[PDB]
Amino acid sequence: QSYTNSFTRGVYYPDKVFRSSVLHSTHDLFLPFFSNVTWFHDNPALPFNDGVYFASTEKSNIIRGWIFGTTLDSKTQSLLIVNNATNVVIKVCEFQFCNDPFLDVTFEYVSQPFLMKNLREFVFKNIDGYFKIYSKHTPINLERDLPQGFSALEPLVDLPIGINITRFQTLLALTAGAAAYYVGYLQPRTFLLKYNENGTITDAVDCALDPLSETKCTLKSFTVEKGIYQTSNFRVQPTESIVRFPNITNLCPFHEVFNATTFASVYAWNRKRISNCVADYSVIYNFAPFFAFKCYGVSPTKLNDLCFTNVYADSFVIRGNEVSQIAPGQTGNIADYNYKLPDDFTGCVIAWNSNKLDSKPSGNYNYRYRLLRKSKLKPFERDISTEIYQAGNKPCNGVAGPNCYSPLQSYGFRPTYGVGHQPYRVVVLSFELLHAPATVCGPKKSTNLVKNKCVNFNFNGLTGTGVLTESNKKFLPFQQFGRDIADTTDAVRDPQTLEILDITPCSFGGVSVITPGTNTSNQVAVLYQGVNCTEVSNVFQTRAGCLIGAEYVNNSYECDIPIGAGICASYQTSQSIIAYTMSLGAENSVAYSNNSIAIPTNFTISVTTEILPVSMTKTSVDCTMYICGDSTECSNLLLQYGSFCTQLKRALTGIAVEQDKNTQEVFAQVKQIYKTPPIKYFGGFNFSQILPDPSKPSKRSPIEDLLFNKVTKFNGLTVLPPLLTDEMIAQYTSALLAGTITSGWTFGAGPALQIPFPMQMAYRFNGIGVTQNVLYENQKLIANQFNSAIGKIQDSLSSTPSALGKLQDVVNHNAQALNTLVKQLSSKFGAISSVLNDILSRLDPPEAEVQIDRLITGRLQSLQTYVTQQLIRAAEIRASANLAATKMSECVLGQSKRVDFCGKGYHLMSFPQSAPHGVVFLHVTYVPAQEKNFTTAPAICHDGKAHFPREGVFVSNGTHWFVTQRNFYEPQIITTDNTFVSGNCDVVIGIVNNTVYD
Amino acid sequence: FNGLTVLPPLLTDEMIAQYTSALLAGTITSGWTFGAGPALQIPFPMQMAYRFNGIGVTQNVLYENQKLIANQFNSAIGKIQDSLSSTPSALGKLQDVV
Amino acid sequence: GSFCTQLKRALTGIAVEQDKNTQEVFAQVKQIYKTPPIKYFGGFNFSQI
Amino acid sequence: QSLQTYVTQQLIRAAEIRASANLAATKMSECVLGQSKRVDFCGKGYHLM
Amino acid sequence: LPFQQFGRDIADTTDAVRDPQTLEILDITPCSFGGVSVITPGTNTSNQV
Ligand SMILES: *[C@@H]1O[C@H](CO)[C@@H](O)[C@H](O)[C@H]1NC(C)=O
Ligand SMILES: *[C@@H]1O[C@H](CO)[C@@H](O)[C@H](O)[C@H]1NC(C)=O
Numbered sequence A: 001q002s003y004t005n006s007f008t009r010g011v012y013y014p015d016k017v018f019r020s021s022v023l024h025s026t027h028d029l030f031l032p033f034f035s036n037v038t039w040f041h042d043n044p045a046l047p048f049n050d051g052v053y054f055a056s057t058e059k060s061n062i063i064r065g066w067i068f069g070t071t072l073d074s075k076t077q078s079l080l081i082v083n084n085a086t087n088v089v090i091k092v093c094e095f096q097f098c099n100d101p102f103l104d105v106t107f108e109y110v111s112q113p114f115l116m117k118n119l120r121e122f123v124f125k126n127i128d129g130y131f132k133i134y135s136k137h138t139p140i141n142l143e144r145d146l147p148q149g150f151s152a153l154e155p156l157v158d159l160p161i162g163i164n165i166t167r168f169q170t171l172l173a174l175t176a177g178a179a180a181y182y183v184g185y186l187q188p189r190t191f192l193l194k195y196n197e198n199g200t201i202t203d204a205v206d207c208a209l210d211p212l213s214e215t216k217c218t219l220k221s222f223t224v225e226k227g228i229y230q231t232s233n234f235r236v237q238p239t240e241s242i243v244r245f246p247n248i249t250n251l252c253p254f255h256e257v258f259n260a261t262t263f264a265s266v267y268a269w270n271r272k273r274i275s276n277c278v279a280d281y282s283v284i285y286n287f288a289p290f291f292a293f294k295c296y297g298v299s300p301t302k303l304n305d306l307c308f309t310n311v312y313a314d315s316f317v318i319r320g321n322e323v324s325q326i327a328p329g330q331t332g333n334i335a336d337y338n339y340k341l342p343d344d345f346t347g348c349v350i351a352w353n354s355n356k357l358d359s360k361p362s363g364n365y366n367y368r369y370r371l372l373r374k375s376k377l378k379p380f381e382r383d384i385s386t387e388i389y390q391a392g393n394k395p396c397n398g399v400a401g402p403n404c405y406s407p408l409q410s411y412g413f414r415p416t417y418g419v420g421h422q423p424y425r426v427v428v429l430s431f432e433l434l435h436a437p438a439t440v441c442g443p444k445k446s447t448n449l450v451k452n453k454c455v456n457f458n459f460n461g462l463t464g465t466g467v468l469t470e471s472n473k474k475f476l477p478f479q480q481f482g483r484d485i486a487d488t489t490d491a492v493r494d495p496q497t498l499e500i501l502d503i504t505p506c507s508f509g510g511v512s513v514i515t516p517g518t519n520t521s522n523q524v525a526v527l528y529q530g531v532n533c534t535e536v537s538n539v540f541q542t543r544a545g546c547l548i549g550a551e552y553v554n555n556s557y558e559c560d561i562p563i564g565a566g567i568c569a570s571y572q573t574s575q576s577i578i579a580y581t582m583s584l585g586a587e588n589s590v591a592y593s594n595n596s597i598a599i600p601t602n603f604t605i606s607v608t609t610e611i612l613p614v615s616m617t618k619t620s621v622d623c624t625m626y627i628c629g630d631s632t633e634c635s636n637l638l639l640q641y642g643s644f645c646t647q648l649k650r651a652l653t654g655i656a657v658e659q660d661k662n663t664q665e666v667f668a669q670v671k672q673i674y675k676t677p678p679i680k681y682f683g684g685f686n687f688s689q690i691l692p693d694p695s696k697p698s699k700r701s702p703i704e705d706l707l708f709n710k711v712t713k714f715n716g717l718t719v720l721p722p723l724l725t726d727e728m729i730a731q732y733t734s735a736l737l738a739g740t741i742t743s744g745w746t747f748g749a750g751p752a753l754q755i756p757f758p759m760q761m762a763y764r765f766n767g768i769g770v771t772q773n774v775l776y777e778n779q780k781l782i783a784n785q786f787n788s789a790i791g792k793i794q795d796s797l798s799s800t801p802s803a804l805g806k807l808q809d810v811v812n813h814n815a816q817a818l819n820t821l822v823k824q825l826s827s828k829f830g831a832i833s834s835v836l837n838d839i840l841s842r843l844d845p846p847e848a849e850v851q852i853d854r855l856i857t858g859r860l861q862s863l864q865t866y867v868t869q870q871l872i873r874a875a876e877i878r879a880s881a882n883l884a885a886t887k888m889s890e891c892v893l894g895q896s897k898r899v900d901f902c903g904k905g906y907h908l909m910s911f912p913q914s915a916p917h918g919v920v921f922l923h924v925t926y927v928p929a930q931e932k933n934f935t936t937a938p939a940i941c942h943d944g945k946a947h948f949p950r951e952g953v954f955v956s957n958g959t960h961w962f963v964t965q966r967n968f969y970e971p972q973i974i975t976t977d978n979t980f981v982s983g984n985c986d987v988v989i990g991i992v993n994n995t996v997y998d
Numbered sequence B: 001f002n003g004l005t006v007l008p009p010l011l012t013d014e015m016i017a018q019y020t021s022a023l024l025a026g027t028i029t030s031g032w033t034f035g036a037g038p039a040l041q042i043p044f045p046m047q048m049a050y051r052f053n054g055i056g057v058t059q060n061v062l063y064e065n066q067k068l069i070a071n072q073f074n075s076a077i078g079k080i081q082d083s084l085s086s087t088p089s090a091l092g093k094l095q096d097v098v
Numbered sequence C: 001g002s003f004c005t006q007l008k009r010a011l012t013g014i015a016v017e018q019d020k021n022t023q024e025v026f027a028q029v030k031q032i033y034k035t036p037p038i039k040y041f042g043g044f045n046f047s048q049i
Numbered sequence D: 001q002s003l004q005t006y007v008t009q010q011l012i013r014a015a016e017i018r019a020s021a022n023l024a025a026t027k028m029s030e031c032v033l034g035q036s037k038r039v040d041f042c043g044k045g046y047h048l049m
Numbered sequence E: 001l002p003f004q005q006f007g008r009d010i011a012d013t014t015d016a017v018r019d020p021q022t023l024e025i026l027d028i029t030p031c032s033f034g035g036v037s038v039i040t041p042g043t044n045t046s047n048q049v
């Protein structure tokens, strides 16, 4: 018993197509990675299944070929392969195998032999009438098991034989056969194959192996970034099936049509009509064994499957040999003169002997049959008229005798009679079908009720799937079902016992795979959304669902991978993924008091980045070329639909013009083009990182170059270039920066008025509530902080790609849409093929019209979806562009007092920079720092008069009282110059006695 | 439930209430200083005086009329609850969304 | 075709957008502030808020 | 077609809610985290808080 | 590769085909197509385009 781990082996090329540096997903028979593979070493029949993976490292070549015959004998066609040193000879011809088929050494294919530490990997498959053989021969290092690595199996040969291949046998050529070959069986699987630039498969991923593999298949990438990914759906399958029809009660009078003790005669056969009853044939089959039971219309079992409105029963007694006359198309006295079945009769003829009951020794002359009639009877007719038969050409004159005989003559039945004249009871059943409601059927069956389990149910003709529980609801007596607000069945009354059973849909929910980056680890956790942990490593139940593979930790961290209602997962470090309640932030209690204030004593100049999309890719679609290509028939058919193509073209043109308007609105704020002076000294402020670099031909700033480096045909689809090139947007950005540096905010509101940069920044400090002396006294420190922040901006942008995640997203979305729009060209949409020329060539025009119509409808719906999605995205981008224009006007051409609009902090000035399809704003902000606690008083009482500060707040260091501005601790002596009286001393609450000088 | 599922929001109602409590505490204890940087202690009457200066009214108006302003604010806050309760259409936007 | 994937992506984008909406509106404060235990704010009454 | 109609309508409603959420974020930053001089942005009258 | 006959791109469109007579690799580019735009001043001004 040798069994080995298959590893990642057995991946072949699905088709003849070449692909380069692409990842392709195929649904095809394959060997699942890490699977159950049998290592073999008298020789029973191995099942071929759908396919076989045969891996032989047999250097001795005891294995010469294979026997794929389904019988291994001369009964059927046996596929026989010989792989000698000369050549491979695939033979199919009829061979008389000897008693021991072994050599000392119709349909034939001779080729170069398959054989050459060789790993002979072979894949044998048989689909759509073709037998496919794939081969691979690779050197292996010293090992007695399958090597670790990846090898692709090139196709070797195809055979058009297409016969049934159930069993395969390894051909024996010598008896102890010890051969070291692995055999595995292929399965229908979905795989993802990575082709290199050389055209070969370097690696593969099996979708249904593990959750990480499923998410790799879903994203079509071998590297999965950190996040939570919705992969599949989870449904609980029905374990059992239940059928419930009402109590079989009432029943067809079958016990009366038989066991009647008298069948009258056959000249006037008793006609019995039966309808509206429960059909049960148990008594019919339980009666005496039948001499003749022939059914002409339906099988006896399937009689119960077929429902008949009208059932006709005809009962009579005839002799033994006259039974053969009661059959369709029979000629004979009884058949033509007593009871004639139709040629296309559909019914059962049941006959059983009645000699034991209806035979009398004296002679039972009651039963009679007719032996003289004027003509043959029409089918299904009863003639009871008995007058003197007129055989003679003379008138009978109502009497009998000469040439005038009685029409009827009786059987004389006596028990001593032999078989062939004994009385036989025949009951002919006739079934009629007519176009009206039926309501007559056979024993409707029923199964035991199953509760609290996902079951299929068919309750009184109502079908469904679900979990059946007891219901508190009380139905009215005549009701059967219960239906909720959405018109879905929620309760059912059981027919057999009147019980109200509630129906609950079986558990279903999404499956999400919480993974760190594939670089960080291969461990994953799985979240079943909305599923109780009972219904599905470490199992944890959360409001989102059931989380398997992550351990709950009491401590709280900042959220990393969102899951649900306050639960986030992270890879913190056996130790693995942990789930926790997310921490909103550090708790800080501000020391509030009646007379305590906190005044900052220093500042920080902080530069932040805000990335805003401005424009999206401009696309134009040629409706005729996309839908139809070069086919004239398709164009003629499209003309009937209307002017849809014109509407789509109008919408796309509108989007394109809107994109141009967006870029103009954001960047064309200034009409003049301003140039910075050649002598670039601005009071210690270094704008080199934002100003253009003359050295490189692009004339872009270092930050702009970094942004462009980071972010950075078909079928009627065209990408129209933007009206403004990147160089023109660079010129606009340079003009805005030069105007801001040289003229402050004056260039936005009129003519540019030059002002030294320190003076401009001092006026911005006045704008944020800080005096000029703060800037002029701390000019070098402010300059150094600004320089350090601008330096750090480059590193912050470069190191973290996610900072530019907005703009890139736009690009990706556009590409994705286009790819979908092209991919749906290959979709069939219910037609024969995606290729219009193939449909036109294979099918006649009248039949091809429907296929082309389906393709046109599908492709036109695809175009409409694309245009609507583009319109929604254009609305979003227009909103972003309007926000960017407002920020350019209010943050770059001016100083804004709006909080959090221009950066985080007290806004000083904003610098624009251009990025592919967007704008990056560098906001410079004043952040207070190093705060100190002081005692404060609303007013100072001097000379019985209150005193309030003109600007600032009254503060105390503990013994002395000063007046200082809010945002910077600059204590000043309280003087009448910085105070105003405004009232007496009694009214104000919290007033402090103190001295005010003059 | 025919394949339609409702995903829970990431932030629970308790967590949003906790953000709202943080915002209110910051506004009451620190004025607008907590938005632009570290939160700085300031007595609430001083904050209202600075807000009066912002709207163009001197500090003496607040300090001299502090009880009146406090009573007016308290009465308005008291009336807000009754006004919301009386007219359901006040919350008609959110309901409509749902 | 791949209509199911497009619809699923659209709904997922909507969901993430809703979470980001709530984050943007409410998560502006970096730290969680607590009001002092003694609630006297110069006669102002914040008990209802 | 029914599902695509639902997704498109829900995307439009998501755009409307996103506009409302951006307005709410702006109002939180400008009215709650500061004093706004913008007329009628934060209530009717001269905005205090 | 010796067994491969067609070539497909990332969009599942044919980009290379092997010549059945002689084994040579032939690249297929789509035949030139584009849109046509007419730049005109107002017909009230002039008729040149
Ligand atoms: C081996 O097979 C080839 C294939 O037809 C055949 O020509 C040759 O005669 C065979 N040789 C032996 C060993 O019989
Ligand atoms: C695959 O491509 C690489 C390209 O660098 C080349 O070095 C290598 O030889 C190729 N392998 C082949 C042709 O088998």
Ligand SMILES: *[C@@H]1O[C@H](CO)[C@@H](O)[C@H](O)[C@H]1NC(C)=O
Pocket (backbone or CB within 6 Å): A247, A495, A496, A497, A498
């Ligand atoms: C059907 O027969 C069962 C046998 O126990 C009985 O309990 C039930 O009441 C019957 N159905 C009706 C509708 O009476």
Ligand SMILES: *[C@@H]1O[C@H](CO)[C@@H](O)[C@H](O)[C@H]1NC(C)=O
Pocket (backbone or CB within 6 Å): A532, A533, A534
């Ligand atoms: C899961 O099932 C248990 C069984 O008692 C129940 O208590 C619990 O409430 C269920 N979970 C949910 C989310 O309803």
Ligand SMILES: *[C@@H]1O[C@H](CO)[C@@H](O)[C@H](O)[C@H]1NC(C)=O
Pocket (backbone or CB within 6 Å): A957, A958, A959, A960
């Ligand atoms: C308070 O400030 C004065 C300056 O006016 C200084 O002389 C004194 O030492 C300081 N002491 C305290 C109480 O902090």
Ligand SMILES: *[C@@H]1O[C@H](CO)[C@@H](O)[C@H](O)[C@H]1NC(C)=O
Pocket (backbone or CB within 6 Å): A993
């Ligand atoms: C301030 O001076 C006045 C003058 O009489 C006095 O009545 C008052 O008590 C002083 N302030 C305090 C807080 O004692």
Ligand SMILES: *[C@@H]1O[C@H](CO)[C@@H](O)[C@H](O)[C@H]1NC(C)=O
Pocket (backbone or CB within 6 Å): B074, B075, B077, B078, C045, C046, C047, C048
């Ligand atoms: C005012 O505050 C008191 C406690 O200080 C409280 O009981 C009362 O309800 C408040 N009134 C309001 C908010 O109208």
